[PDB]
Amino acid sequence: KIKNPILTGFHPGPSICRVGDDYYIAVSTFEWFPGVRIYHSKDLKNWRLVARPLNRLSQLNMIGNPDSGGVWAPHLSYSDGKFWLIYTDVKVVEGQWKDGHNYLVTCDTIDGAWSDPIYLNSSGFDPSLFHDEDGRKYLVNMYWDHRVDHHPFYGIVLQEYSVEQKKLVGEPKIIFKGTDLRITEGPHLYKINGYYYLLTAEGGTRYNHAATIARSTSLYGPYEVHPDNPLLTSWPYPRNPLQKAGHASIVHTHTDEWFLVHLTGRPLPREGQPLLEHRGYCPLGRETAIQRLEWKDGWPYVVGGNGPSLEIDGPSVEEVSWEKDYDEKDDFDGDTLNHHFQTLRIPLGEDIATLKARPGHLRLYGRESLTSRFTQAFVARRWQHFHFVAETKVSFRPTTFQQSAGLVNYYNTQNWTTLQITWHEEKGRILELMTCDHLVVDQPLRGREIVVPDDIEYVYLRVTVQATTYKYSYSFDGMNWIDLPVTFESYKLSDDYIKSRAAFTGAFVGMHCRDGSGQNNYADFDYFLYKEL
Amino acid sequence: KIKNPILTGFHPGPSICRVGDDYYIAVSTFEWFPGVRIYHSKDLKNWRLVARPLNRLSQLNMIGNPDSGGVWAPHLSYSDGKFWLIYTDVKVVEGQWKDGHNYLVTCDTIDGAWSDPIYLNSSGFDPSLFHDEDGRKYLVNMYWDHRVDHHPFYGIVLQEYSVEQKKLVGEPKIIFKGTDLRITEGPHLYKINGYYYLLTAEGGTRYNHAATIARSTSLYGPYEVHPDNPLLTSWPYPRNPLQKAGHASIVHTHTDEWFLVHLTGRPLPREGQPLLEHRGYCPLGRETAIQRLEWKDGWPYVVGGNGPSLEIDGPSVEEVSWEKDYDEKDDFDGDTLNHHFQTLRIPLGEDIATLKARPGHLRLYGRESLTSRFTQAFVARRWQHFHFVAETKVSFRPTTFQQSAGLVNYYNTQNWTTLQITWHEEKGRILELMTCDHLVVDQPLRGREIVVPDDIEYVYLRVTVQATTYKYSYSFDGMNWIDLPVTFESYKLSDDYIKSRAAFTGAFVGMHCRDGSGQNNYADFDYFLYKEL
Amino acid sequence: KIKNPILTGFHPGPSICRVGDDYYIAVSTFEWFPGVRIYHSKDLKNWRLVARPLNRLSQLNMIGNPDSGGVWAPHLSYSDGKFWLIYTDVKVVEGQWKDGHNYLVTCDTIDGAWSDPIYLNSSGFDPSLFHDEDGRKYLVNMYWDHRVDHHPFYGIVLQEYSVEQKKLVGEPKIIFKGTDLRITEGPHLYKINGYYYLLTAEGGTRYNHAATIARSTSLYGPYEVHPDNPLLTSWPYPRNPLQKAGHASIVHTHTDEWFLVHLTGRPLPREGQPLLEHRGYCPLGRETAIQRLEWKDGWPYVVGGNGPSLEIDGPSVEEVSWEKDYDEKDDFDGDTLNHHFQTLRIPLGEDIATLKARPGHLRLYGRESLTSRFTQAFVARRWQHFHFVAETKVSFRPTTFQQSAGLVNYYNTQNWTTLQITWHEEKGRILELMTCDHLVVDQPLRGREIVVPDDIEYVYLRVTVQATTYKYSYSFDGMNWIDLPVTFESYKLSDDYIKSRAAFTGAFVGMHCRDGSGQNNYADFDYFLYKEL
Numbered sequence A, B, C: 001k002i003k004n005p006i007l008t009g010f011h012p013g014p015s016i017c018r019v020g021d022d023y024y025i026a027v028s029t030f031e032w033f034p035g036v037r038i039y040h041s042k043d044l045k046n047w048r049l050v051a052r053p054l055n056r057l058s059q060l061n062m063i064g065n066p067d068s069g070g071v072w073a074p075h076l077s078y079s080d081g082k083f084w085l086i087y088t089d090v091k092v093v094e095g096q097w098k099d100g101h102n103y104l105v106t107c108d109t110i111d112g113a114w115s116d117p118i119y120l121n122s123s124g125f126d127p128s129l130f131h132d133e134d135g136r137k138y139l140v141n142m143y144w145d146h147r148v149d150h151h152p153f154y155g156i157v158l159q160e161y162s163v164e165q166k167k168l169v170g171e172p173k174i175i176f177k178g179t180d181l182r183i184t185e186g187p188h189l190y191k192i193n194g195y196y197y198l199l200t201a202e203g204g205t206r207y208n209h210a211a212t213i214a215r216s217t218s219l220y221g222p223y224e225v226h227p228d229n230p231l232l233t234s235w236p237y238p239r240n241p242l243q244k245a246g247h248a249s250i251v252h253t254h255t256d257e258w259f260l261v262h263l264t265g266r267p268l269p270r271e272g273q274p275l276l277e278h279r280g281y282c283p284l285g286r287e288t289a290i291q292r293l294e295w296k297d298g299w300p301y302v303v304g305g306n307g308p309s310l311e312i313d314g315p316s317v318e319e320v321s322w323e324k325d326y327d328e329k330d331d332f333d334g335d336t337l338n339h340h341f342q343t344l345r346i347p348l349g350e351d352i353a354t355l356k357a358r359p360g361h362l363r364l365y366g367r368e369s370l371t372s373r374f375t376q377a378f379v380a381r382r383w384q385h386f387h388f389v390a391e392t393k394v395s396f397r398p399t400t401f402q403q404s405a406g407l408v409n410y411y412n413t414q415n416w417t418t419l420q421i422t423w424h425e426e427k428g429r430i431l432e433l434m435t436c437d438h439l440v441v442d443q444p445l446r447g448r449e450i451v452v453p454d455d456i457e458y459v460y461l462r463v464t465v466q467a468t469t470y471k472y473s474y475s476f477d478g479m480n481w482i483d484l485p486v487t488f489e490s491y492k493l494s495d496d497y498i499k500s501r502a503a504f505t506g507a508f509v510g511m512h513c514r515d516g517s518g519q520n521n522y523a524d525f526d527y528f529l530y531k532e533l
């Protein structure tokens, strides 16, 4: 019935929410704007994007945010007639500190205009809101320990949230320290039968990842741990195509069934490599998957052992499928950018990105370079398949090497490749390749660049991704294409390749314009094509 | 008569400006807020702070800015009855790119309300506005080349500025590539006798720094180089107490005398070390110095070789000294903080830094860690002498290790030391030392932290700097002091120690409060003392 | 009945050999001289050193050998009335190459003058000699692939050795490529029932280490792999005190029982640390353990699951205990140094190390520094316990800072600590601490070294090791002891801490003398004590 992952490409930190017979997953968006994606389903198999809640600077201001900063795992719940969304803005992602803030916004409907944030606390990420039977509300999050002699993951902190006062009240208490896996995060609370169940993520979001669960009769513990913990992990299953299984959330359907959504990474093919030495590279980042649960002696169990199954049986409901929500060839005739497109850190106004200046075109006025955490004229969508083609057609007339426009495959400010139009003193208007690998830049077509003929209005730019490797090609007519003589490697656009380990996103493909002279020179993109192959 | 440096501690990129018999110097402030510091003098010997122009968000918004980003060398000039101030907001300081923006603001007076900014260009830093004899206006700045096979310093660009239209007009053109020293920056135009003189900086701002001068009868050149170039350098003079002499600007006095202001580094004592292996560590960063000029066959010459003299002869005017503009022991008696105090990146509002919550105290509401480029509750002043004592007295009751308050010696987010009050599970409220060295944190007193007794209202914190080393000490009563058994080295808070090369500021000393839990806990500082020794 | 590890401290690559009811284990010695240790047992429980075969330069010349080069896993067998020992001299241990040569030496008795080496091949380390029932002899070893785009572990090469001709004959052929674990290493061949069994080490000698076994009816393959492979591994057992379980060799007893000897690492205690993030630091290096086997459908199985047991049941033989073979307090009254003492790389003559010069003393004439891979006057023994005291008493009169003598805890040339006597210009003869971490040297008592009175003939030096930490102490009278106030960490002398990953030995403790001036100055050591707890 259901083949995993249900949300492919960059979809980490899934939070699942039942409202009667409708089902929602919110996922993390990190430095990508707007913040948070929410998908809806009737059958837990087919999913459509229904909301992008954090779209006002008053809710989310990420200017200058570090790569993999911003919106970490969000938490979606529904109570007292409305949806409650908890989210982070993480400012510091390397070193002894992890400075970041937790906020609450609400809405009566999933896709309405959500409130402005209520500040909660800053003590650690992965905040979650629990709505207890007695009407009381409680916030759980991880508690961060910066000290040199200590492990940073101090445990799970709980504090009561007063709806009326719009603040946490009483005193914060640590209710759980974790198991020896440590790196205890992603807390979620569930009242099931006579117990409070505390779900956590442990072992860290790489290959040691796990979901741990514990129970207590008191909300403040002590929590006894599942006798066969972890509840879920891929660590002991180095051949399982789904790796890094953890950061889960429990759903109890109206049909009286139990399911567990979680993140996972799907490494590239590794045949010929030591099984255990390095466990793989995931260009699609961390994706969302689902597992069935069954109950024994008051403990849930992942059906089919504690590793993730590639295929599961969905709940006992009618299949409800959805119509495709993007054009394979986006001609840019719409009056609002398709909802699979996102921007870096900030909203781009009409002065930077516009469908109005030239109907049928996305116009990007040139801003800062691909290494800037501030203002980039860059519109991009997720790699969502191992095998795909992406294509654009652009008119751009640069007058200086400081200006560029092109097709970009992008992980972060220091890790990307592009096929771009720029200008050269002797050759004039040119096509080139450019890579950035940990801030180190290469120009592979150095002194060998494609001269673009004066009479050519539109350059056609394409990338063809074939799992491990990909290639850029170009055309001056849309019919006759020419390969550029460089093979690129997808593993360099993956979480696992990044040396900082603040690497929580996934690969994007998009359209970029830079004008480092500040002459407000723009590029006109006639269309954007993305097609699974 | 005049002993260099004239402006001590962090004072780089000096821009001198004459208005009648009044003399102004504008210096760069980088990430420190508010932006730009302007000093006034009557004799060029004695200098007083009179303006801090960039104090509104509309003019300067630096949240998230990299360390040593922001306001690089500024340009101050006077024409048509008003002051003209050109400044940068530099966003990228590492890698192939140096993304940054150039802005103009004006004021009828030096210390009034400066206009909101007019956007100029982004083609490169070190902007300077030239006021030609015909009433036409011209902007010069360096032109940035990002390409792998290229030297970044493409030379000096020039473009006319239209006052009426509030933008640059016509086509920008390179007017000078520089000499073989390269790293051509800090361009300044002067129309003297029959020639346009172009003053630049070359060799980079380290020990190869120079001031280059060229001339032409045509504004657009080509320019011919001084026959005994450079005009000023420290490179050939390893025994000079003033290194890195470059980035100059020229003044013509009302007494028909000529002077050259420039930046300089003052290395710490390095006796018994190889003269040329490593030329030193400057914790006071780049300071401002002044050289006399003489003329020979249409070319200016620095009086006493092209190396910087430690002492010069002032201009033919009566000496005007200024009263001390701060208290050695600042009791926080005003309704405003003393103007030697700055904040990181952003203004701090009363919600973070206030003299109104506890009379005669600076209260700091705890924000993010010392490693955050966003919101730090931190108020600091420059190290301005090699030997000094600094001290503060603070009331603070932390309820968690996520909370701290202390005395901080600080270079950047990743380089600093501190004597701070925090909380410990066993020991309760404690004093500890903490250092950060390229993001790597040490706690020198780990396991032996100072227990602060419950009846102590105030803890006194002191640093005593003695050139190459410094020590922290504490007191519970203000009378009996105890040294902490750790000697710190001042070279670790110096330009030359930082391994990023983007190290353009200097050491500061100040008061910090962090609340990582987000409970809005605060510290009350009764006084802040700074005293030269 | 038998408690693991059976061979404690640095004892890797064990090769077990049965001769009647006599059992022998040979282990690797790498850069430590003489080469190879052979231990004897009657019961497989109690083990005593009986031979150090490679004691002549014709056999083993290792001057300048890199750290963790030289004698890797040896192979010991018995056939046709004599003992056969196969060994390596590995010359290159980092990079694409692993340059090293395999040699064969023989002896009629375990402890006799072994022959001079017969050169065998150079194609890869882990040589092993197999004696087929029909009286033919074949050499197995790993085949090394240096190529950029290739996994370096090509598989197992096999070739017949001609006894008469003193050389290998025929064509070499690959009989096994390995499993997906790769890093296929440590080949041993056995003829059991109708099958040849090929035992290998896979997964590398760190935490993914395994014992792999396969079978064929032909010597040359193909080999079908054990259906529940690995035969032995610690990888899935992160809580097991015995880690890195692998590099096995099989023994069939005279009692018709089956056991497996293997290497193992015991990580230091790491309570509070994430279970899986980093699996530990092993200052005792790789030790020798023993497991029991049983048979099932023509395949051997480790009794107690495929992980290693801490305690096993020994073979049904009468126990034979051995006398302690060293003095807790070695007064140096013997004619030869105790056989638990080794030297680095080369044997030392009476001109360097002598028990004869001063009666009741070991005299070491000072040679080169602790960072020298050539001539060190160094005599050391293994750390063999997590808790121990080691102690010496030394007479030394340095006349220059170039001269030192002391007590050393030593991993390799770039990683060690010492308490040592040297000379200072003002203070004179002093006691100091020195450490070396990846070639980086520190002196934690600089400016506060202990002045040794001129009337003191002997300085007493002690180290007390307590698992994760150790402390040096001293005495002038041998009754009153002063701790030096520095706490050292044992993990810095562990396999796992070393960056090069050529880290194949373990911590030693010993006596050193340097004379960097070449004046042949010496130190007289009165005793050396080593005592568990």
Ligand SMILES: [Ca+2]
Binding pocket: A330, A331, A332, A333, A360, A361, A525, A526, A527
């Ligand atoms: Ca179109």
Ligand SMILES: [Ca+2]
Binding pocket: B331, B332, B333, B359, B360, B361, B525, B526, B527
């Ligand atoms: Ca006061």
Ligand SMILES: [Ca+2]
Binding pocket: C330, C331, C332, C333, C359, C360, C361, C525, C526, C527
């Ligand atoms: Ca003796």
